[PDB]
């Protein structure tokens, strides 16, 4: 009815960063492009950490913790966003846990695209910009993490979605009836059908010139699933072989046999 308006408003209310805000900054923040500028950013933006010995541990481990905290914050926003999607609040709690557990990282990497351009990505609530080359320059496996996300973002951003489209796309990701271990599949599938239907209708008027946008976006959801499959393999490598990269407990829960 007004389903699409309710989802857009929940998105604007619950996410601190979005594409309009991001593009204002991406079109100034502090550019992090080597060890030195990374240290300057830390000294001014997180002064308490620099005076607690965080500059002792590796640059990769510091960036790791930055990204980890961002994902943790975003999972909280995504949970609050999901609670405001009409129907989600009525699902069983375990079904609600399943949907978030398998859905948040597809949503995060979808939304990550909004804070990226070809040269780097915004960090620290839009006050920092870490360069693509600098991430590429870190030691394995860290230099392997963001690069496929940049690749996804460049094509995803070429579709020229705005926040109203992205809000429906993310809602479709969360309300996914084929997540493993779902109980009330028939009702969640019905929720997705409604969301996907209003997304198709919204794309028809918001992007009247790209008549093929809707099936392109459907394929992007499949690409995100694969993207998260590959990303989880990087998480294991970190779990297995990195001493100072402790996984946040909330994230350990999400990644448990996914």
């Amino acid at each position: 009815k007004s389903l699409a308006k309710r989802i857009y408003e929940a998105y604007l209310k619950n996410f601190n960063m979005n594409k309009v805000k991001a593009r204002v900054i991406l079109s100034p923040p502090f550019v992090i492009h080597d060890m030195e500028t990374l240290c300057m950013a830390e000294k001014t933006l997180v002064a308490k950490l620099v005076a607690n010995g965080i500059q002792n541990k590796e640059a990769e481990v510091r960036i790791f913790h930055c990204c980890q905290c961002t994902s943790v914050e975003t999972v909280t926003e995504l949970t609050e966003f999901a609670k405001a999607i009409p129907g989600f609040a009525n699902l069983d709690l375990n079904d609600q846990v399943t949907l978030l557990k398998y859905g948040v990282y597809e949503a995060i990497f979808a939304m990550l695209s909004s804070v990226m351009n070809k040269d780097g990505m915004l960090v620290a609530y839009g006050n920092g910009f870490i360069t693509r080359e600098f991430l590429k320059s870190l030691r394995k496996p860290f230099c392997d993490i963001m690069e496929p996300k940049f690749d996804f973002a460049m094509k995803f951003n070429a579709l020229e979605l705005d926040d109203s489209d992205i809000s429906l796309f993310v809602a479709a990701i969360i309300c996914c009836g084929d997540r493993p271990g779902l109980l009330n599949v028939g009702h969640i599938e019905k929720m997705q059908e409604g969301i996907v239907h209003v997304l198709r209708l919204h794309l028809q008027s918001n992007h009247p010139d790209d008549i093929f946008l809707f099936p392109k976006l459907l394929q992007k959801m499949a690409d995100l699933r694969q993207l998260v499959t590959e990303h989880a393999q990087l998480v294991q490598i970190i779990k297995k072989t990195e001493s100072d990269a402790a996984l946040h407990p909330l994230l350990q829960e999400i990644y448990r046999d996914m």
């Binding site: 709690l93 846990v97 978030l100 909330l250």
Partner: peptide, 11 residues
């Protein structure tokens, strides 16, 4: 127990 549950059950 589950941290995702606590997120979902919060005010």
């Amino acid at each position: 127990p589950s941290l995702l549950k606590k997120l979902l059950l919060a005010p």
